[PDB]
């Protein structure tokens, strides 16, 4: 239908990845009517491009167009996501992600779907290589319903086998796909297009779709509007133009000569614009206009940050209010520390990718003291530093996508502080699990040496002095467990302060040479082993049969029984425990 004033500014697209040879064959055309651009980042096409590769899917001419172009931007990685998730619109509206039919789900696939949900942004998936099927009687650029109507019963039966296995696929991993065609709710389902890089079947409904859920779904995000919208893509060093900005203009004119700022890593950039870059069939420009990929050459762009807004100053405007405005968002990341100081330290590349390591942590519950962006230098290793007192634990760096300095990390070495790198945060989580496993493992042995169970020996025998020491002792109070640490206490009478002679562990105790793991009080008297690593007093030195001896409790011994043995211990135990506490002077 048509409403009053209801068309709408070009929309944004990209495909992640099969993907090259899918843009391929989208961006190929016979036509030298037709015409499609090539632009710094991106590839656009006019309105008639996509009628024209559309039309196959739209015989009758039925469905309308309301926008001017499509606007498709190529780019290796996740450069369309470098902005906040806020204004993501402004770099995307709408993301493909490709998969091959014949081999099914894969991880890189199943990590940027992820990202796409944890952004919020909309997307769908171009099921590709489907000529690949058994019997595929293929049809050149032809719409997939009308080739799939064309085949043979048993290759329709392939391609819904096929189908389901993926459709299974998406489902063990927690997303509900659907045929773009049979989709009921594309809030709920993520939508599957077939697709044939190889033939072009399959792409005009791709493109139509596309378009369509732009024009239905996302109106609001593409109206026309006053102010300009332009946002840094990229940060590239070029010959003869030193560090310039890959910028993509949403909305609005550029003009060389425009006073510029933008987000920089030592604060607001104050600048001008001294080219405006195109690709070569580089052609300066005295302006641009939206929809465009542009480069810009400027001085002073260094330490510009990828997904940074572009702002101009007018005539009629303050410098210092845009410069605040413009270092918002970054300033916005900043905030986001704990307010207690304890958390990992994070460090990304870009402003999105930082804000998508964050939201990741927070989901996952993760603290996080300190953040920033671009290369790890030593000043934010010793901010770091900090947790090694604070907690030990978040003692660690999780940095994205990021170059490490060479003084930082050795630091970091000197000073155990571990700095986790990745392209991937997922892959961060991993490090971090890791690491958080093996503390706690640690922990638990630690915790296993000072699991001291309380007892009271009376020594009836010596049957070897020491190295091992072996005593015939009654188990008067308490039980003796195997790994106990046992001691004496001798009084000097002179000093009035007490010699606490500790003798090491019992690993072995035996009544009649029959091996035993404990022995609770009243039962007969037992001859234990007791040995330590370092240097044992002897008995007949330092020791007398007359000494008692005590299950060697700790303040951080006793920490520890009830922590995790409550359930475990006795109520006679624990008043053990209380009068042991008098005879070893715990508080």
Not at 8 to 30: A, E, F, M, V, Y
Not at 384 to 398: Q, R, T
Request: proline share 4%.
């Amino acid at each position: 239908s048509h409403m009053n004033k209801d068309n709408l500014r070009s929309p944004i697209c990209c495909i992640l990845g099969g993907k090259t040879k899918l843009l391929d064959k989208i961006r190929q055309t016979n036509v030298q009517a037709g015409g499609i651009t090539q632009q710094i980042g991106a590839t656009y096409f006019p309105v008639e491009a996509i009628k024209q590769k559309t039309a196959v899917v739209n015989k009758d001419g039925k469905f309308e167009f309301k926008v001017p172009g499509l606007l498709i931007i190529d780019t290796p990685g996740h450069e369309s996501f470098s902005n906040l998730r806020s204004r993501g619109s402004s770099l995307c509206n709408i993301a493909i992600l490709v998969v091959d039919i014949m081999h099914g789900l894969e991880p890189q696939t199943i990590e940027s779907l992820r990202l796409l949900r944890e952004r919020k942004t909309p997307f769908v998936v171009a099921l590709n290589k489907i000529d690949r099927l058994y019997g595929w009687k293929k049809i050149e650029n032809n719409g997939f319903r009308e080739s799939f109507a064309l085949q043979n019963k048993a290759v329709q039966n392939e391609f819904r086998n096929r189908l389901d296995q993926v459709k299974l696929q998406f489902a063990e991993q927690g997303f509900n796909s659907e045929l773009f065609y049979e989709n009921k709710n594309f809030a709920r389902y993520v939508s599957l297009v077939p697709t044939s890089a190889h033939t072009g079947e399959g792409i005009p409904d791709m493109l139509k779709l596309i378009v369509q859920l732009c024009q239905e779904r996302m109106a609001s995000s593409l109206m026309y509007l006053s102010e300009l919208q332009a946002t840094v893509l990229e940060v590239k060093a070029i010959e003869g133009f030193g560090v310039t900005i890959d910028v993509i203009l949403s909305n609005g004119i550029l003009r060389e000569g425009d006073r510029i700022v933008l987000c920089g890593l030592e604060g607001p950039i104050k600048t001008n614009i001294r080219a405006l870059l195109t690709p070569a069939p580089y052609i300066h420009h005295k302006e641009v206009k939206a929809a465009q990929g542009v480069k810009i050459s400027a001085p002073g762009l260094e330490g510009a940050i990828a997904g940074s807004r572009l702002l101009v100053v007018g005539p009629d405007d303050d410098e210092e209010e845009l410069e605040e405005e413009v270092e918002s968002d970054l300033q916005s990341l900043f905030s986001r520390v704990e307010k207690t100081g304890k958390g990992v330290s994070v460090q990304a590349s870009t402003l999105g990718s930082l804000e998508a390591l964050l939201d990741f942590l927070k989901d996952c519950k993760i603290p996080v003291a300190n953040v920033g962006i671009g290369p790890v230098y030593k000043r934010d290793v010793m901010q770091c530093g900090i947790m090694l007192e604070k907690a030990p634990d978040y003692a660690v760096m999780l940095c994205f996508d990021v170059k490490v300095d060479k003084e930082a990390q050795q630091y970091a070495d000197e000073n155990g502080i571990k700095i986790f790198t990745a392209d991937i945060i997922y892959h961060l989580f991993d490090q971090f699990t890791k690491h958080m496993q093996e503390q706690l493992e640690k922990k638990k042995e630690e915790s296993k040496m000072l699991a001291v169970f309380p007892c009271v020996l009376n020594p009836v025998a010596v049957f070897n002095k020491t190295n091992p020491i072996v005593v015939g002792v009654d188990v008067v109070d308490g039980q003796l467990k195997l790994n106990t640490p046992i001691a004496a206490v001798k009084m000097n009478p002179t000093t009035g302060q007490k010699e606490i002679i500790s003798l090491g562990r019992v690993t072995g105790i035996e009544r009649d040479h029959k091996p035993l793991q404990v022995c609770k009080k009243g039962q007969p008297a037992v001859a234990i082993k007791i040995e330590m690593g370092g240097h044992q007093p002897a008995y007949g030195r330092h020791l007398d049969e007359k000494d008692v001896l005590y299950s060697h409790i700790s303040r951080a011994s006793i920490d520890v029984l009830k922590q995790f043995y409550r359930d475990v211990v006795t109520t006679d135990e624990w008043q053990l425990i209380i009068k042991l506490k008098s005879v070893f002077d715990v508080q």
